[PDB]
Design an enzyme around this catalytic site. Sequence first.
Site, PDB file in Angstrom:
ATOM      1  CD  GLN A  19      -1.157   0.034   3.701  1.00 39.98           C
ATOM      2  OE1 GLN A  19      -1.497  -1.051   4.169  1.00 39.98           O
ATOM      3  NE2 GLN A  19      -1.631   1.185   4.159  1.00 39.98           N
ATOM      4  CB  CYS A  25      -4.738  -0.668   5.887  1.00 41.13           C
ATOM      5  SG  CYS A  25      -5.745   0.312   7.038  1.00 41.13           S
ATOM      6  CG  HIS A 163      -2.655  -2.443   9.528  1.00 42.14           C
ATOM      7  ND1 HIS A 163      -2.812  -1.737   8.361  1.00 42.14           N
ATOM      8  CD2 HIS A 163      -1.758  -3.423   9.261  1.00 42.14           C
ATOM      9  CE1 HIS A 163      -2.063  -2.286   7.417  1.00 42.14           C
ATOM     10  NE2 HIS A 163      -1.418  -3.313   7.939  1.00 42.14           N
ATOM     11  CG  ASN A 183       0.836  -6.123   6.918  1.00 45.26           C
ATOM     12  OD1 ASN A 183      -0.020  -5.300   6.598  1.00 45.26           O
ATOM     13  ND2 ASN A 183       1.753  -5.879   7.863  1.00 45.26           N
TER      14      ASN A 183
HETATM   15  C1  LIG Z   1     -10.656  -1.089   9.904  1.00 44.08           C
HETATM   16  C2  LIG Z   1     -10.076   0.239  10.393  1.00 44.08           C
HETATM   17  C3  LIG Z   1      -9.246   0.080  11.671  1.00 44.08           C
HETATM   18  C4  LIG Z   1      -9.247   0.856   9.249  1.00 44.08           C
HETATM   19  C5  LIG Z   1      -8.840   2.303   9.476  1.00 44.08           C
HETATM   20  N1  LIG Z   1      -9.878   3.254   9.203  1.00 44.08           N
HETATM   21  C6  LIG Z   1      -9.531   4.635   9.484  1.00 44.08           C
HETATM   22  O1  LIG Z   1      -8.475   4.941   9.938  1.00 44.08           O
HETATM   23  C7  LIG Z   1     -10.598   5.660   9.123  1.00 44.08           C
HETATM   24  C8  LIG Z   1     -11.902   5.329   8.676  1.00 44.08           C
HETATM   25  C9  LIG Z   1     -12.503   6.594   8.431  1.00 44.08           C
HETATM   26  C10 LIG Z   1     -13.955   6.850   7.938  1.00 44.08           C
HETATM   27  C11 LIG Z   1     -14.622   7.780   8.932  1.00 44.08           C
HETATM   28  C12 LIG Z   1     -14.717   5.531   7.880  1.00 44.08           C
HETATM   29  C13 LIG Z   1     -13.919   7.500   6.552  1.00 44.08           C
HETATM   30  N2  LIG Z   1     -11.609   7.518   8.700  1.00 44.08           N
HETATM   31  N3  LIG Z   1     -10.463   6.968   9.106  1.00 44.08           N
HETATM   32  C14 LIG Z   1      -9.271   7.717   9.483  1.00 44.08           C
HETATM   33  C15 LIG Z   1      -7.817   2.659   8.401  1.00 44.08           C
HETATM   34  O2  LIG Z   1      -8.141   3.044   7.323  1.00 44.08           O
HETATM   35  N4  LIG Z   1      -6.402   2.512   8.668  1.00 44.08           N
HETATM   36  C16 LIG Z   1      -5.900   2.092   9.968  1.00 44.08           C
HETATM   37  N5  LIG Z   1      -5.590   2.879   7.585  1.00 44.08           N
HETATM   38  C17 LIG Z   1      -5.100   4.245   7.614  1.00 44.08           C
HETATM   39  C18 LIG Z   1      -4.836   1.819   6.925  1.00 44.08           C
HETATM   40  N6  LIG Z   1      -3.875   2.226   6.223  1.00 44.08           N
END
Ligand SMILES: CC(C)C[C@H](NC(=O)c1cc(C(C)(C)C)nn1C)C(=O)N(C)N(C)C#N
Length: 216
Positions: A19, A25, A163, A183
């Site tokens: 990624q 992720c 993650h 991963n």
């Molecule tokens: C399953 C979950 C833990 C994944 C986690 N999800 C987020 O961080 C996330 C989701 C949202 C909305 C509000 C749904 C739009 N906003 N953020 C910042 C993610 O995407 N991670 C850890 N990345 C960065 C990877 N790479």
Amino acid sequence: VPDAVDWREKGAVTPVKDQGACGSCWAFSAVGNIEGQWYLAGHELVSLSEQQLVSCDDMDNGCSGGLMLQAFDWLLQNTNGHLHTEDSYPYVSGNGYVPECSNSSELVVGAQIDGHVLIGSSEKAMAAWLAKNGPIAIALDASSFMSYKSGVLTACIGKQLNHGVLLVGYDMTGEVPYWVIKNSWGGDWGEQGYVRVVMGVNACLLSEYPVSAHVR
Ligand SMILES: CC(C)C[C@H](NC(=O)c1cc(C(C)(C)C)nn1C)C(=O)N(C)N(C)C#N
Ligand code: NA
């Protein structure tokens, strides 16, 4: 309950991806799960496009994060569940920038989902579900993955979901039973892109959000 399941050896898992610096992720997790459900429904294993979700899914937030269930919903609501192939829609967001969504005529549909499930947040139930149905998209705390090189992680920090990855198998035949996780940090990280984590203690909080698409 089989002692060991390995969906890689059974043909349901594509090569490891990377990624990059993008917070995508959620897309790698979702697509890896779709790849497995697609194969297990009787179709040829094919690598599918994380970039389509990163660039086109307006429920999620591109390189700033997302959720695997929302990614499935976006497909169901906007493409009738169709996902393009990686070959035709390759990943270009490794540096953190998200280009505009493509609707080029050279895009090739590789798979179609028709639903999704949230699996009960229990490790024992996940093992039974995975043994019958294939790889599970999960959220976990990857803090302990930063220093991981090889072996079975028996001490995982389990504090915050930060993650998303793909659960591809388990093995209970040794002293330490373990899960096998794909991963999205490239094939040089960990064990050719994989990490093993002990089973039965909610290591890394891995049972908090287990999900899968559904394929006809
Ligand atoms: C399953 C979950 C833990 C994944 C986690 N999800 C987020 O961080 C996330 C989701 C949202 C909305 C509000 C749904 C739009 N906003 N953020 C910042 C993610 O995407 N991670 C850890 N990345 C960065 C990877 N790479
Ligand atoms: Na390595």
